[PDB]
Amino acid sequence: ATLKDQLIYNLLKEEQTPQNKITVVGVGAVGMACAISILMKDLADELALVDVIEDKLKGEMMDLQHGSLFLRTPKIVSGKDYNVTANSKLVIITAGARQQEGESRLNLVQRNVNIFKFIIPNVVKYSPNCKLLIVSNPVDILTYVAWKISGFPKNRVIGSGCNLDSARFRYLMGERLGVHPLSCHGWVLGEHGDSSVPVWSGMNVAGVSLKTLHPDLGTDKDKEQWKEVHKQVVESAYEVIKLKGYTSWAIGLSVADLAESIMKNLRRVHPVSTMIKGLYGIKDDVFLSVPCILGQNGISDLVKVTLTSEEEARLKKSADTLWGIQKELQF
Amino acid sequence: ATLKDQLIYNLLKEEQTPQNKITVVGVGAVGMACAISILMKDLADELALVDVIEDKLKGEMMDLQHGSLFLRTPKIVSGKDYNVTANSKLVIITAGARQQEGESRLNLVQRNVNIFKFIIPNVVKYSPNCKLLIVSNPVDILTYVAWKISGFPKNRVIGSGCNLDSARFRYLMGERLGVHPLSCHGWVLGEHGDSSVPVWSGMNVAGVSLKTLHPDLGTDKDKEQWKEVHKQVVESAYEVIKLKGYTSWAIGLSVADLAESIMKNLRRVHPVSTMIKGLYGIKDDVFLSVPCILGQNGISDLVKVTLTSEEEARLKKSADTLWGIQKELQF
Amino acid sequence: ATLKDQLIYNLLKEEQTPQNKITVVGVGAVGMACAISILMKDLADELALVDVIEDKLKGEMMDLQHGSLFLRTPKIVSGKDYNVTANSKLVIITAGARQQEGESRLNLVQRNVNIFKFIIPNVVKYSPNCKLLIVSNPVDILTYVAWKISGFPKNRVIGSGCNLDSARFRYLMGERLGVHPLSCHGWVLGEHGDSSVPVWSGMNVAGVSLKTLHPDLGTDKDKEQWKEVHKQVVESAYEVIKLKGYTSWAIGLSVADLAESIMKNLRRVHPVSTMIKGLYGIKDDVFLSVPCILGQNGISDLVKVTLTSEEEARLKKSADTLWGIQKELQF
Amino acid sequence: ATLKDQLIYNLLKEEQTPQNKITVVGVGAVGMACAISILMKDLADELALVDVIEDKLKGEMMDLQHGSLFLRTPKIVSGKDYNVTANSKLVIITAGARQQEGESRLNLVQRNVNIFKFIIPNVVKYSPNCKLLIVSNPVDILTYVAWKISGFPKNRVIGSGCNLDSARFRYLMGERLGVHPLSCHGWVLGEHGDSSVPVWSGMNVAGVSLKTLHPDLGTDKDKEQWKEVHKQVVESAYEVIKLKGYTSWAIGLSVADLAESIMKNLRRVHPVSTMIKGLYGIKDDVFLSVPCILGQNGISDLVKVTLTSEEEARLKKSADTLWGIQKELQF
Ligand SMILES: NC(=O)C1=CN([C@@H]2O[C@H](COP(=O)(O)OP(=O)(O)OC[C@H]3O[C@@H](n4cnc5c(N)ncnc54)[C@H](O)[C@@H]3O)[C@@H](O)[C@H]2O)C=CC1
Ligand SMILES: NC(=O)C1=CN([C@@H]2O[C@H](COP(=O)(O)OP(=O)(O)OC[C@H]3O[C@@H](n4cnc5c(N)ncnc54)[C@H](O)[C@@H]3O)[C@@H](O)[C@H]2O)C=CC1
Ligand SMILES: NC(=O)C1=CN([C@@H]2O[C@H](COP(=O)(O)OP(=O)(O)OC[C@H]3O[C@@H](n4cnc5c(N)ncnc54)[C@H](O)[C@@H]3O)[C@@H](O)[C@H]2O)C=CC1
Ligand SMILES: NC(=O)C1=CN([C@@H]2O[C@H](COP(=O)(O)OP(=O)(O)OC[C@H]3O[C@@H](n4cnc5c(N)ncnc54)[C@H](O)[C@@H]3O)[C@@H](O)[C@H]2O)C=CC1
Ligand SMILES: O=C1C[C@H](c2ccccc2)CC(=O)[C@@H]1Sc1ccccc1[N+](=O)[O-]
Ligand SMILES: O=C1C[C@H](c2ccccc2)CC(=O)[C@@H]1Sc1ccccc1[N+](=O)[O-]
Ligand SMILES: O=C1C[C@H](c2ccccc2)CC(=O)[C@H]1Sc1ccccc1[N+](=O)[O-]
C-alpha cells in the first residue's frame, strides 16, 4: 500500500555483498583526500570510513553521500565499529598520532604501534583477505608494524613509501624540462621523506638517460645543479606544511593511483614500501621503497634496481636506523 | 650546451593562451573542493587560484601541483593579483566572510558585498568575457550583486543556487526508494537554503510521477510524510555543519558538474540561480533558481516550470525578502 | 638467469579467479562495438571473446590487445572453446544470423534458437552464476530462449530490449528542444523495434511533463505531430541499415551503459526486457521492456509504469505475437 | 506559442562556434575507430565526418548520433563538402586505399597521394589554423605530402607514425616480463613499416636498463631472441590483416592518445612522423618517427634520442628508403 510499493515491484531481496569495497581508516585531511580521489576515479562499489572522532566521521560521510548524484559509488558508510569495513578488498590506513616537540622517534613510533594494536586486528577480523595500504607516518616503520600485527603475507602489506616523493620529483623534473610529468621518468627510493634516495641512473625522457648525457648529474660538480631537484622535493614538503599546515591533495591523488593498480589488477610498477630483507645486503625485517608490481594480490613482484655504492649505502643506513627502532618496539 | 638543449631540439617558442582556463576565487574548503573536482574531471587546461590569505593560497597551489603526475591539467597557478586569472572561460567565486558572534544578517550580507566590490571588478578586468559562477552565501543575493557590479549580461552570471539542495534531495529520494540518485528526478527551486521549494509535481522515476500515484505527496495529511524528505535536506545542512564545521565535498562536486556543462557546451538542464524578473508575477531585480540550460555562453535558456499557487507564492515571498535587503545595500 | 629473473624478484605466483570479467559472444560489428565501449569505460579486469569464425576472432583479439597500452583492462582473451569464458560476471550474447530474403519470422528465429542451443549451455557450464545480457534479434524472443535454456532465475537474464529505442528517442527529442538527451526524459517500452511503445505521459524535461503543457502530445491531431519522433526512431533504424548495412556504435554504447550499472551495482533504471508475466493483463511467459533497476544481481526490481488503455493493448498485442512464435519453437 | 516556447524561455539566440572541434576524414574502419575512441574520451565538442561515399557517411554519422545519450559531444555532423569541417582544431586524415593481404604500405603511394591532392587543400581552406594528423598509409610519406600541399609549418603536420608500433612493442614486452605495458618502456622509431628501428639501448622498467643487464639484447647472439619481439611488431599489420582483413581498434586508440595530448596541451612525448632533418646527419626533408613533445601547437619539440652505431645506421637506412620515395613525388 505504500508509495515505494505502488512505484516498484521487487523480484528478490538476496545476498548483497560488495565486490570492490575500499576502506579508509582515519578521516583527517589525508584520509578524505584519499576518499575523494578514489570516489572520482570510480574504483569502488562501496566505500567505508572509520575514525575515533565520531562527529567528524559522521559529518564527512554525510558530505560525501550528498555528492552521490555526481559519483558512481552507490554506497558510502562510516562508523567507529569495524563491522562497516567487512569484505573490503583494500584497506587504507592514515590513522595515527602527531609527533610533538621534543618527542623521540621511538616514543612516537611506540604510540602509533599502540594505536595499530587496536586498528589492525579489527581490520583483519572483518576483511581477512584484504590488501593493506599504510600511509601513516613514519610510513616505513608503520608498514612493518601492520605486517607484524596483521600476520598477513608480505605481498598484502604495502606502504605508500616513496610514491609521493617520486611524484613530486617527476613534477619538478617536468617543470625544468617543459614536459608533462607522465613522460618524465625518475625514481626516488629507500626511506620515505627526508632520507629518500633519487636514482639518477634511471632519470630519463623517451629512454634517454639524463645521467649519460650529463655525467655530472647528481654530483656536486654539476654546474646545472640537478641534485637540487631532489633537494626541492624535500623542501617542497616542509614548505607545504609551513604554508597550509598539512598535505592532502597530492598524497590523496597518489594513493588513488596505487588503489587503481590494485583494484583493477593492472600490474603497473610503483615506488612503494615492501619487505626489503635479502636485498642490498640488508638482513633485517625492514620495509623500504623499491619499484613494485601492483595488482590483485598486492605486491606480486619487485624490480631489482642496480644502485651506485652511495645509493646502496644510503638505503642500508636507513635500514639500520629503522631496525634499531623496530627491535625496541613492544607488541 | 645545457642538458635541456642536449635532450630537446625546439621547433617553436612563442606560447599561446590557455584555451579552457578556469579560476577559483577563495581557497577555503569549498573552493579547494571545487578545484580538486575540476582537476579530476579534466575540464581545464589551466587552473588559477586567488585568495587574500597568501600563505594558504601558495600552499594549496603547491599541493595540487604535486599531484600533476596523476592529472591532465598541465598548468596550475595562483596569486593575490588577478593577472594570474587572465583569459578565464569560467570564474567560480567561493570567497566569503563568515558570520561572527552577534553580527546581524544584513551586516553579514554587506560584508560579503564589500568583498565582491573588490573581487568582481578585478575578475572583469582580466577576463571580460568569462562566465561567472557564484557560490558564496547568501548565494542568490551575491549573484545579483555580481551581475550588478560586473555589468555582464544575465546569461554569463550564474548562481549555484538550488543545485546542491536538489542533489541532496535526490540522494535522500534515492535512499528511500533504493534507486541510484541519477534515476531519481526531483527539483528543488527558488531561494537556496532554508526557504527552498520542493516541486512535488516533477518528482519521478522513469517518468512515473510520484504525485500522480500518491496525490497527498507533499501535504501534511500525507500518510507517509514525504514532505520530511525536503525537511531532511534542510536538516542535513545544519547537521553537517554541526558535525564537521563546514560542507565541502558535495558542493565541490555539484559545482564541477555545472562547470562540465558550461566548459563542454553540453546544454544539460540544471537548477541554478538566474534573473527571474517577469516570471511568477515577480517584478523586482532578483535571482532565484529554476532549471536552466547551461553551455558555452552560460544560461542560454531557462525552463518554465508550472508551479502551484502555493509554490509561486513561496518564490514571490523569497523575491520580496531578497529585494528588501538588496535596496538597502551600499555599492 | 633469464633477463626477466635478473630484473624481477617474484614474491608469489598468482593467480586469482577472475573478479570483474565480461564475455562477449559473437564478434561481428555489434559484438566488437560492445567490446570497445566496455574496454574504454574500464568496466572489466578481463574480457573474453567467443565466435565460431576462428581467424576473425583471433584477429579482433590481437587488434584489441595491441591497444593495451591505452587501456586499463589487463587481460584480453578469445577462443572457440568456452573455457576462455570461465568465471564471467556478465556474458553478452551478440551472436546470430540476420533476417533473410523470403524467409519468414519463425524460420529466422529458429536459426538463432539453434545457435542458442549450443551457446547457452556452454556459457552456463563455465559461468553458472553469471548474468546474461542478450542482444541478438529478435531480442525479446531470444531473451526468453536464453532464460528457458539456461535455467537461470529471471533476475539474471536481461534483454537489451528498448534501451536503444529509448536512446534514439531521447536523441531526437533533444534535437527538437535544443537540449542534451541526458536532460530529455522519455521512455520507449514494450517490444523492441517496429512495435515499441512511446510512453507519452512520462516525457519530460526538468519534471515538466510535456503531455500536461500540451495534451495533444502523441495524438493524431497534434498540430506539432510529436508522434513523428517515435515514427522517426523506427525510420532511423531502417535508414541506417539502408545507408550503412548494419548498426554498431549506438547499440555498442547502449550495452556498455547496461554493463556499467550491472558491473558497478549502480541500481540505475533502464528500459530493458524482462519476464513480464503478471503485468498489464499479460499471462504468457514473454519478455518485454519496462524500466528495471540494474545491479550486481541483474534485475532486482522493476518500475510499475501506469499505461493508458491503448498503451496497455499494444503491449498485450506484442505479447500474443511473441508467445505465438514461442509456443512453436523447438528446444 | 509552440510546445518548445511554452517549455523553454530563450535568453539569447545566435549560434556560437565550437571550442574543440575535431574532424575525421574517411569513415572506413580506421576513421570510425578513431571517432568512437575520440568520442569516448570526451576530447571534442563537435565531431565532423567526411567521405566520398555519401550513404556510408550519413549512416555512420547517424549511428554515432544515436549514441549521444551515452556521450558528452553535443554535435556530430557529416558531409561530402568540406564546409562541415570549418573551425576544426584538429583534422585527422584516414581516407584512402589500405593494404590487401601481403601488400606493402609503400604500394599505396600513387593512389593515396592523388587523393591527398584533393583532400588537403580542402581541409586547409576551411580550417587554416588546424593541426593535421595524418593516419592514411604509407603514413610517413603522406605526412610529407600533407606538409608540402598544405603550406603549414611542420609543427602542425603530424603523422600517427610509430605511436602504434611502440604500443605493440610495449604490449609484447609486457607479456614477456609480466608487467603492464604502461610500465614497460621501449621505443620503435623510423618508418611505420618494414624498416622501423627498435631502440634497444633505451628499453627499461623503472629506469633499469635491460641492455645493461643483458648486453646481447636485440642482437643475433641473444639467447632469448628479443629481436623476434621487433619482428612481431613489423609483421603485426600483416598478421591482423590476414586474420580479420584490416586493423582498426589499436590505431583508433593510438590516434585518440595522440589527439588527447594535442587537444589538452599535455606536452607528453610520443613517437610520431615528423621532419628529422638535422638529426643523425640527415640533410633530406624526410619524415619519419622520432619522439616528439605534443601539445596545442602540435609538435613543439623533438627529443634527441642517443642511438648506438647500429641503431643509428638502421634509422638512416629507413630515412634513405623513405626519402627515395618522397623525393620523386610530383606536386
Ligand atoms: N606516506 C606519505 O607520503 C604521507 C603520509 N602522511 C601521513 O598521513 C597521516 C595522516 O595525515 P593527516 O590526515 O594530515 O593527520 P590527521 O591527524 O589530521 O588525521 C588523523 C586521523 O586519524 C584518526 N585516528 C587517530 N587514532 C585513530 C584510531 N585509533 N582509529 C581510527 N582513527 C584514528 C584521527 O582521529 C584523525 O582523524 C599522518 O601520519 C601523516 O604524516 C601525510 C602525507 C604523506
Ligand atoms: N551555494 C551553496 O550551496 C553553498 C555555499 N557555500 C558558501 O561558500 C562560501 C565559502 O565557503 P567556505 O570555503 O567554507 O568559507 P571559508 O571561510 O573557509 O573560505 C572562504 C575563503 O574566502 C576567502 N576570501 C575572503 N575574502 C576574500 C577576497 N576579498 N578575495 C579572495 N578571497 C577571499 C577567505 O580568505 C577564505 O579563504 C561561503 O560563503 C559559504 O556559505 C557553502 C556551501 C554551499
Ligand atoms: N537488440 C538491439 O537493439 C540490436 C540487435 N542487433 C542484433 O545483434 C545481432 C548481431 O549483429 P551483427 O554484429 O551486425 O551481426 P553479424 O552477422 O555481423 O555478426 C554475428 C556474429 O555472430 C557469430 N556467430 C554465429 N554463430 C555463432 C555461434 N554458434 N557462436 C558464437 N558466435 C556465433 C557470427 O560468426 C558473427 O561473427 C543481430 O541479431 C542483430 O540483429 C543489432 C542491433 C541492435
Ligand atoms: N598509420 C597506421 O598505423 C594505420 C593506417 N591505416 C591506413 O588507414 C587508411 C584507411 O584504412 P581503412 O579505414 O581500414 O580503409 P577503409 O577502406 O575501410 O576506408 C577508407 C575510406 O576512405 C574513403 N575515401 C577514399 N577516398 C577518399 C577521398 N578522396 N576523400 C574522402 N574519403 C575517401 C573511402 O571511401 C573509405 O570509406 C589506409 O591508408 C590504411 O592503410 C590502417 C591501419 C593503421
Ligand atoms: O608532505 C608531507 C607532510 C608531512 C611532513 C613530515 C615531515 C617533514 C615534512 C612534511 C608528512 C610527510 O611524510 C609528507 S611527504 C615528504 C616529507 C618529507 C620529505 C619528503 C616528502 N615527500 O613525499 O617528498
Ligand atoms: O550546507 C551548507 C553549509 C552552510 C549552511 C548555512 C546555513 C545553514 C546550514 C548550513 C552554507 C550553505 O548554504 C549550505 S547548503 C544548504 C544550507 C541550508 C539549507 C539547505 C542547504 N541545501 O543545499 O540543501
Ligand atoms: O538498428 C537496428 C538494425 C537492425 C534492424 C532490424 C529491423 C529493422 C531495422 C533495423 C536490428 C535492430 O534491432 C535495430 S534497432 C531498431 C530496429 C527497428 C526499429 C527500431 C529500432 N530501435 O532500436 O529503435
B47 marked ligand binding residue: yes
Q: Of the bound ligands, which one is closest to the alpha carbon of residue D51?
A: 4
In Å, the largest CA–CA distance within chain A is 83
Pairing status of strand D197-198 against strand D75-78: unpaired
- Chains near C with 3+ CB pairs less than 8 A apart are A, B, D
Residue pair D40/C37 in contact by the 8 Å Cβ criterion: yes
Q: What resolution does the deposited structure have, in angstroms?
A: 2.1
The residue among A47, A33, A52, A28 whose CA lies nearest residue A114 is A52
Q: Is the CB of B29 under 6 A from ligand 2?
A: yes
Whole-number Å distance, alpha carbon B234 to ligand 1 midpoint, is 31
Give me the catalytic one of D66, D180, D185, D192.
D192
DSSP 8-state assignment for residue B184: -
Three-state SS at D249: helix
* Exposure string for D98-111, b = 16+ CB within 10 A, e = fewer: bbeeeeebbebbee
State the cell numbers at A136. Answer: 601513516
Q: Do A12 and C300 touch (CB under 8 A)?
A: yes
Sign of the torsion formed by the C-alpha atoms of B111, B115, B121 and B123: negative
Distance from CA of D214 to the nearest CA of C (A): 6
Residues in chain D whose Cβ is within 8 Å of chain B: 6-12, 16, 18-20, 42, 45, 72, 74, 153-155, 260, 264-267, 278-279, 293, 296-297, 299-304
Beta bridge partners of A209: A204
Q: Is the CB of C160 under 6 A from ligand 3?
A: yes
Can you tell me the distance from the alpha carbon of C82 to that of C93, in angstroms, rounded to the nearest whole number?
Answer: 13
The residue among A62, A68, C184 whose CA lies nearest residue B170 is A68
* Exposure string for B164-176, b = 16+ CB within 10 A, e = fewer: bbbbbbbbbbbeb
A276-281: long-range contacts, CB 8 A cutoff, minimum separation 24: A276/A315, A276/A319, A279/A304, A279/C9, A280/A307, A280/A312, A280/A315, A280/A316, A280/A319, A281/A312, A281/A316
Beta bridge partners of D198: D188
Report the nearest atom of ligand 4 relative to the CA of D53.
Answer: 35
Q: Is the CB of A192 under 6 A from ligand 1?
A: yes
Q: Is the CB of B98 under 6 A from ligand 2?
A: yes
Residue pair D104/D47 in contact by the 8 Å Cβ criterion: no
Residue pair D49/D77 in contact by the 8 Å Cβ criterion: yes
Three-state SS at A288: strand
Nearest 5 degrees, angle CA C172-CA C175-CA C176?
90
Sign of the torsion formed by the C-alpha atoms of C139, C144, C147 and C148: negative
Tell me, rounded to whole angstroms, the distance of Cα C260 from its chain centroid. Answer: 12
* Exposure string for D300-326, b = 16+ CB within 10 A, e = fewer: bbbbbbbbeeebbebbbebbebbbeeb
Q: Which of D12, D260, D266 sits opposite B155 (nearest CB)?
A: D12
Beta bridge partners of B294: B268, B299
Cβ neighbours of A200 in B, within 8 Å:
none
Nearest 5 degrees, angle CA A201-CA A204-CA A207?
105
Q: Could you give phi then psi for residue A300, rounded to 5 degrees?
A: -80, -30
Q: Do B202 and C207 touch (CB under 8 A)?
A: yes
Residue pair A299/A130 in contact by the 8 Å Cβ criterion: no
CA-CA distances (angstroms) from residue C273 to C164, C187, D208? 11, 13, 54
- Chains near D with 3+ CB pairs less than 8 A apart are A, B, C
The backbone region for B151, taken as left when phi is positive above 0, alpha when psi lies in -120 to 50, beta otherwise, is: left
Cell 595524418 found at: D134
How many of the other CB atoms lie within 10 Å of CB of C10?
A: 14
Distance from CA of B224 to the nearest CA of D (A): 32
Can you tell me the distance from the alpha carbon of A180 to that of D293, in angstroms, rounded to the nearest whole number?
Answer: 9
Q: Do A224 and B3 touch (CB under 8 A)?
A: yes
Q: Could you give phi then psi for residue A7, rounded to 5 degrees?
A: -85, -40
Sign of the torsion formed by the C-alpha atoms of C159, C161, C164 and C169: negative
List active site positions of A: 192
DSSP 8-state assignment for residue D106: G
How many of the other CB atoms lie within 10 Å of CB of A43?
A: 22
Q: Of the bound ligands, which one is closest to the alpha carbon of residue B30?
A: 2
Report the nearest atom of ligand 7 relative to the CA of C237.
Answer: 1
Q: Is the CB of B234 under 6 A from ligand 6?
A: yes
DSSP 8-state assignment for residue D83: G
Three-state SS at B243: helix
Residue pair B303/D8 in contact by the 8 Å Cβ criterion: yes
DSSP 8-state assignment for residue D86: T
Whole-number Å distance, alpha carbon B236 to ligand 6 midpoint, is 8
Residue pair D116/D110 in contact by the 8 Å Cβ criterion: no
Q: Do C167 and D70 touch (CB under 8 A)?
A: yes
Cβ neighbours of A301 in C, within 8 Å:
8-11
Can you tell me the distance from the alpha carbon of B325 to that of B142, in angstroms, rounded to the nearest whole number?
Answer: 11
Cβ neighbours of B306 in C, within 8 Å:
208, 212-213
Cell 633505451 found at: D202
Domain annotation for chain A: domains and CATH numbers: 14-161 (3.40.50.720), 162-329 (3.90.110.10)
Cβ neighbours of D43 in C, within 8 Å:
none
Can you tell me the distance from the alpha carbon of A303 to that of A291, in angstroms, rounded to the nearest whole number?
Answer: 5
| Residue A1 buriedness (CB in 10 A; 0-12 / 13-18 / 19+) | exposed
Pairing status of strand A21-25 against strand A46-50: parallel
Whole-number Å distance, alpha carbon B25 to ligand 2 midpoint, is 9
Residue pair B146/B116 in contact by the 8 Å Cβ criterion: yes
Can you tell me the distance from the alpha carbon of B46 to that of B27, in angstroms, rounded to the nearest whole number?
Answer: 16
Q: Do C45 and A155 touch (CB under 8 A)?
A: no
List active site positions of C: 192
The backbone region for C26, taken as left when phi is positive above 0, alpha when psi lies in -120 to 50, beta otherwise, is: left
The residue among C28, C56, C34 whose CA lies nearest residue C47 is C34
Sign of the torsion formed by the C-alpha atoms of A71, A74, A80 and A84: negative
Nearest 5 degrees, angle CA B47-CA B49-CA B53?
165
- Chains near A with 3+ CB pairs less than 8 A apart are B, C, D
Residue pair B99/B108 in contact by the 8 Å Cβ criterion: yes
Can you tell me the distance from the alpha carbon of B282 to that of B287, in angstroms, rounded to the nearest whole number?
Answer: 10
Residues of chain A immediately before an interruption (C to N > 2.5 Å): none
Ligand 7: residues within 6 Å at CB?
C 137, 164-165, 168, 193-194, 233-234, 237-238, 240-241, 247
| Residue B16 buriedness (CB in 10 A; 0-12 / 13-18 / 19+) | exposed
Residue pair A253/B73 in contact by the 8 Å Cβ criterion: no
Q: Do B207 and C186 touch (CB under 8 A)?
A: yes
Tell me, rounded to whole angstroms, the distance of Cα C321 from its chain centroid. Answer: 21
Can you tell me the distance from the alpha carbon of B282 to that of A84, in angstroms, rounded to the nearest whole number?
Answer: 50
Q: What is the 3-state secondary structure (H, E, C) of C90-125?
A: EEEECCCCCCCCCCCCHHHHHHHHHHHHHHHHHHHH
The residue among B125, B150, B167 whose CA lies nearest residue B272 is B167
Q: Do C14 and A297 touch (CB under 8 A)?
A: yes
Sign of the torsion formed by the C-alpha atoms of A196, A199, A202 and A208: positive
Residue pair D155/D262 in contact by the 8 Å Cβ criterion: no
The residue among C134, C170, C188, C173 whose CA lies nearest residue C250 is C170
Beta bridge partners of C299: C294
Sign of the torsion formed by the C-alpha atoms of D181, D182, D185 and D191: positive
Three-state SS at A12: coil
Cell 605511436 found at: D163
D32 marked ligand binding residue: yes
The residue among C107, C100, C93 whose CA lies nearest residue C147 is C93
Three-state SS at A67: coil
Beta bridge partners of D23: D48, D91
Residue pair C273/C289 in contact by the 8 Å Cβ criterion: yes
Cβ neighbours of B6 in D, within 8 Å:
304
State the cell numbers at D252. Answer: 583508433
Beta bridge partners of A188: A198
H helix intervals, chain A: 3-7, 29-40, 54-65, 105-126, 139-150, 163-177, 210-213, 227-244, 249-263, 309-326
The residue among A37, A71, A34 whose CA lies nearest residue A49 is A34
How many of the other CB atoms lie within 10 Å of CB of C102?
A: 5
Beta bridge partners of D159: D134, D273
Cis check for the bond before B74: say yes or no (omega within 30 of 0).
no
Residue pair C322/C140 in contact by the 8 Å Cβ criterion: yes
Q: Of the bound ligands, which one is closest to the alpha carbon of residue B116?
A: 2
Q: Do B59 and A214 touch (CB under 8 A)?
A: no
Q: Quick one: which H or E segment has residue C240?
A: helix C227-244
- Give one DSSP letter per residue of D23-82, joined into a string: EEE--SHHHHHHHHHHHHTT--SEEEEE-S-HHHHHHHHHHHHTTGGG-S--EEEE-SSG
Sign of the torsion formed by the C-alpha atoms of C22, A265, C294 and A40: negative
Can you tell me the distance from the alpha carbon of D7 to that of D236, in angstroms, rounded to the nearest whole number?
Answer: 56
Whole-number Å distance, alpha carbon A224 to ligand 5 midpoint, is 25
DSSP 8-state assignment for residue D85: G
Q: Do A55 and B244 touch (CB under 8 A)?
A: yes
Give every CB contact of residue B23 below 8 A, 6+ residues apart in sequence.
B47, B48, B49, B50, B84, B85, B88, B90, B91, B92, B123, B127, B130
CA-CA distances (angstroms) from residue D169 to A129, A294, B196, D158, D181? 36, 21, 59, 21, 9
Can you tell me the distance from the alpha carbon of B42 to that of A133, in angstroms, rounded to the nearest whole number?
Answer: 27
Can you tell me the distance from the alpha carbon of A126 to that of A87, in angstroms, rounded to the nearest whole number?
Answer: 6
Q: N- to C-terminal Cα distance for chain D?
A: 58
- Give one DSSP letter per residue of B268-314, joined into a string: EEEEEEEE-TTSTT--SS-EEEEEEEEETTEEEEEE-----HHHHHH
Pairing status of strand B90-93 against strand B131-134: parallel
The residue among A257, A318, A309 whose CA lies nearest residue A289 is A318
Residue with CA nearest ligand 7 atom 17: C193
Tell me, rounded to whole angstroms, the distance of Cα D146 from its chain centroid. Answer: 13
Residue pair C325/C287 in contact by the 8 Å Cβ criterion: no
Give every CB contact of residue A228 below 8 A, 6+ residues apart in sequence.
none
Q: Which of A12, A16, A42 sits opposite C155 (nearest CB)?
A: A12
Q: Which of B32, B53, B135, B272 to probe ligand 2 with, by most ligand atoms within 8 A of CB? A: B135
Residues in chain B whose Cβ is within 8 Å of chain D: 6-12, 16, 18-20, 42, 45, 72, 74, 153-155, 260, 264-267, 279, 293, 296-297, 299-304
Can you tell me the distance from the alpha carbon of D166 to that of A272, in angstroms, rounded to the nearest whole number?
Answer: 27
Q: Could you give phi then psi for residue C204, rounded to 5 degrees?
A: -160, 155
The residue among A115, A104, A108 whose CA lies nearest residue A50 is A115
Which method, experimentally, gave rise to this model? X-ray
Pairing status of strand A268-275 against strand A287-295: antiparallel
Whole-number Å distance, alpha carbon A303 to ligand 1 midpoint, is 29
H helix intervals, chain B: 3-7, 29-40, 54-65, 105-126, 139-150, 163-177, 210-213, 227-244, 249-263, 309-327
Q: Of the bound ligands, which one is closest to the alpha carbon of residue D105?
A: 4
Give every CB contact of residue C326 below 8 A, 6+ residues apart in sequence.
C141, C144, C284, C285, C286
Nearest chain C residue to D214, by CA: C3
Q: Do C7 and A304 touch (CB under 8 A)?
A: yes
* Exposure string for B36-48, b = 16+ CB within 10 A, e = fewer: bbbbbbbbbbbbb
Three-state SS at B135: coil
Three-state SS at B20: coil
Cell 624540462 found at: A177
Could you confirm whether D185 is annotated as catalytic?
no
* Exposure string for C39-61, b = 16+ CB within 10 A, e = fewer: bbbbbbbbbbbbbeeeebbbbbb
